[PDB]
Curated annotation (Swiss-Prot), chain A:
This is Integrase. Its cofactor is Mg(2+); Mn(2+). It comes from the Viruses. Residues 174-221 bind DNA. The gene is gag-pol. Mg(2+) 3 binds at residues 16, 73, 109. Homodimer; further associates as a homooctamer.
UniProtKB/Swiss-Prot annotation, chain B:
The core domain contains the D-x(n)-D-x(35)-E motif, named for the phylogenetically conserved glutamic acid and aspartic acid residues and the invariant 35 amino acid spacing between the second and third acidic residues. Each acidic residue of the D,D(35)E motif is independently essential for the 3'-processing and strand transfer activities of purified integrase protein. Residues 1-163 form the Integrase catalytic domain. Its cofactor is Mg(2+); Mn(2+). The lineage of its organism: Viruses, Riboviria, Pararnavirae, Artverviricota, Revtraviricetes. Catalyzes viral DNA integration into the host chromosome, by performing a series of DNA cutting and joining reactions. This recombination event is an essential step in the viral replication cycle. Has a strong preference for using the 3'-OH at the viral DNA end as a nucleophile. Binds 8 Mg(2+) ions per integrase homotetramer. Zn(2+) can also be a cofactor for the nicking activity, but not for the polynucleotidyltransferase activity. It comes from the Viruses. Homodimer; further associates as a homooctamer. Residues 169-216 bind DNA. Mg(2+) 3 binds at residues 11, 68, 104. This is Integrase.
Amino acid sequence: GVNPRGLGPLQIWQTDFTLEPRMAPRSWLAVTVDTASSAIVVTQHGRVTSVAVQHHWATAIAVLGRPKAIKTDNGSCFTSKSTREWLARWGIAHTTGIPGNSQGQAMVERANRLLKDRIRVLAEGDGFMKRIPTSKQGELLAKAMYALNHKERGENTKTPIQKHWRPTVLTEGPPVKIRIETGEWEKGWNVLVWGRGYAAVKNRDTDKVIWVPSRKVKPDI
Amino acid sequence: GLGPLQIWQTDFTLEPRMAPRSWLAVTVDTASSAIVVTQHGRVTSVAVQHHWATAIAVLGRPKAIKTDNGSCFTSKSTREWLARWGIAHTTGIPGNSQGQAMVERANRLLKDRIRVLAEGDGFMKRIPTSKQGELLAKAMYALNHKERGENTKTPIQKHWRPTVLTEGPPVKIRIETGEWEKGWNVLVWGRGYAAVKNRDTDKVIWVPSRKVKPDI
């Protein structure tokens, strides 16, 4: 249940590498998403390396501030003594899951899709149904980052950038009931975040926070 | 002229420590004092365009930008570029205090940071190319996320005015009398119910979503 999802900005980040053929020859995009505000940072790289990753996070930090922890996968660029020491110097905790849709890399997985679609739209919009000219990649990538952060993601009233600097973080949370394994509804929990997919619930007696499927929680009354 | 994203000052500045791409494009928001920098091989039109695209992805779209009268700012591409971005562009004589003094000071602050970081990492001369990108980002992080000295607010604080909201927007709830009473704020929505907190009694109750509405 300790899913990598922060309750507020700068608590938990998810970083990843995604290939975008449209941006070749340097088609590697390093992507990071603040699991709480959902804002994202992307940089272009010609190769998946520890050096690239370090350069990438330094950029994200410059943009979003210093996070408390970053979740990634077992990739060598993340587990290298070099990066491990880099994180340590920045005082940023690190956790590695596994390359996939495993609880700990899903949010950044979706961020890749979003980023990729935005790119395809700006690419075809400029007539580049194929590879984007090398000299127009930077700007186009920035245009994408801009759109994704400085413009609500539809269902949301507020934009990511809005959620990042001026977040809403409840101090207590209304009481709820969660459907325990037995399929029975249990009292004693309060919800702090209730998304379409997942809800964050804290235990009233242990102050433990866990994320559960939104349909396993209902108002307590 | 308080107000972020109102007026920006942009210029180039030479920094040998960043060679080959030793030409740094510099922009500073005249209200928040936030600074964005990108390195380039040569001062051109596409360069400023790349820089502004970047600076925008970082700080947002500006209303107007000021520069000197160098070719890269007064060319055809650049003017059309800004027009497409819908950004007002003014020029002036290089150094003109009117609208170049602040970015000029920005130049020096940037360079000082670069020196300190570079030397601090054992680079007394040209900083290795592979490490330039990160150092540049580290500089921006310091210049924008840390206080200068006099000012008690950091550029990021002036630019984004961060704060932590502890409740949703003000709402009104239909009571048993059919009336819509104000004084409540939405905490969380779910399962067709809205959890509202009274901003007077701090009382928190669950109320059917249908009996909830905004309150200006």
